[PDB]
């Protein structure tokens, strides 16, 4: 019941990866995708870069964006962490844990309601 990094997952890592992509898509995020090197998939498929429109910015007409990278790790056989980190905020035109944490809550709700 203590604080732990990320969100806990179990089962199959490709099934978890699928669920993560489905949750990102329901939340409206955009994301990178696995590319197969020489026809074959690499474990870098478990590193996802995502871009999220910021609702409060979006409502006021702005193209400002939040960048979140996801990383699946095996903790032990059957148990995984989804690590989720902020890569920052950028407006189309040229620090804080918010809106990052408000976006993580969105992700978490999609993962939990799947």
């Amino acid at each position: 019941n203590k604080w732990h990094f990320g969100v806990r997952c179990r089962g199959d890592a490709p099934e978890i990866l699928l669920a993560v992509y489905r949750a990102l898509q329901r939340a409206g995020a955009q994301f990178t995708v696995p590319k197969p090197v020489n026809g074959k998939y690499r474990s870098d498929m478990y590193t996802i870069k995502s871009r999220w429109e910021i609702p409060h910015c979006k409502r006021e007409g702005k193209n400002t964006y939040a960048y979140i990278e996801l990383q699946l790790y095996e903790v032990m056989p059957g148990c995984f962490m989804l690590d989720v980190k902020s890569n920052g905020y950028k407006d189309i035109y040229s620090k804080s844990s918010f809106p990052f944490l408000d976006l993580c809550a969105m992700l978490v709700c999609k993962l939990f309601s799947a």
């Binding site: 910021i54 609702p55 409060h56 910015c57 006021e60 400002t64 939040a66 905020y89 950028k90 407006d91 620090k95 804080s96 918010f98 809106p99 408000d102 809550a105």
Partner: protein, 325 residues
């Protein structure tokens, strides 16, 4: 800097210049936690999160807007309780505040006049004097430090500064506190008449309507002889209603007090002959929230609150609701 009063006068100037030269940011630990609540949290849940985190207060977050949405303190409950007790012909109506989200409780408080229009905050990198002056103007006893993320327009709650942590910071850093050697009875400071007091037989709701009306954070409890026994603070209200039991508001101060955990800050006292040097020294080593001025017989004579002290050291000289507690 010649005799006592002249050495004190000098020392007080050094202390204000010091407050002005520091920022509010300077007061913070190098690394700390800040506990923030969504404004749409239910009232019951929020009281539960306060108890389990051993806090009495939390900043609110409107996450849709990415905006600071106010400060939840015990004054919120004290004010609505007092309103219901004064205006309601129905004693059980108070229970209804458990249907509320924090957003809905705040809207009841706006409606009754218990919340100002201009909500109070300072920039963390602005002078510490700004924080003191805002708290002095409003009668708020804590103040949020808010910056803005220019890339997103998102407000960044940095921390929430307390009168105690400011006085502690001063005690730790200004050597001049040791030169404040004028006895209290030769200063215009503190409150010495028309004190609001209670006894162990007093109803908690009458105390709580003392705290709102007088806008104080605590009421000293005396006996028939006026000897100081204990205190009933607005933070004690939390313990009475954390379980959902608003009929606990009908208890005597004595019965209520028997529920208090050993977590207690304590009841601090001084004499009219004591000085600010010794007081800043107690502040340095203890969570002192106020001092009751007593005589040899523990007879209550006055109150020196933290606000009293801060407002003395920062000035050149030269509604019926509780403010943020």
């Amino acid at each position: 800097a010649m005799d006592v009063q002249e050495t004190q006068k000098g020392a007080l100037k050094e202390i204000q210049a010091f407050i002005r030269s520091r920022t509010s940011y300077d007061v913070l630990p190098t690394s700390f936690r800040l506990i923030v609540f969504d404004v749409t949290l239910f009232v019951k849940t929020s009281l539960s999160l306060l108890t389990l985190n051993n806090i009495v207060s939390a900043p609110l977050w409107d996450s849709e807007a990415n905006k600071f949405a106010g400060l939840l303190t015990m004054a919120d409950f004290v004010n609505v309780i007092k309103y219901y007790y004064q205006s309601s012909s129905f004693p059980e109506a108070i229970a209804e505040i458990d249907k509320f989200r924090l957003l809905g409780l705040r809207e009841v408080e706006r409606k009754i006049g218990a919340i100002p229009p201009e909500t109070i905050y300072v920039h963390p990198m602005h002078s510490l004097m700004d924080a003191c002056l805002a708290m002095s103007k409003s009668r708020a006893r804590r103040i949020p430090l808010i910056d803005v993320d220019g890339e997103t327009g998102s407000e960044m709650i940095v921390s929430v500064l307390t009168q105690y942590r400011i006085l502690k910071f001063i005690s730790m850093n200004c050597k001049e506190t040791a030169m404040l050697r004028v006895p209290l009875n030769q200063m215009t400071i503190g409150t010495w008449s028309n004190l609001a007091t209670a006894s162990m037989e007093t109803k908690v709701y009458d105390v709580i309507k003392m705290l709102a009306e007088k806008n104080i954070s605590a009421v000293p409890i005396v006996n028939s002889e006026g000897t100081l026994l204990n205190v009933y603070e607005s933070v004690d209200v939390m313990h009475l209603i954390q379980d959902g039991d608003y009929s606990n508001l009908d208890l005597s101060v004595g019965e209520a007090l028997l529920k208090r955990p050993a977590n207690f800050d304590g009841v601090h006292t001084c004499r009219a002959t004591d000085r600010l040097d010794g007081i800043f020294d107690a502040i340095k080593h203890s969570r002192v929230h106020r001092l009751f001025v007593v005589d040899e017989n523990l007879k209550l004579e006055g109150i020196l609150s933290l606000a009293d002290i801060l407002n003395y050291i920062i000035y050149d000289k030269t509604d019926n609701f509780e403010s943020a507690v």
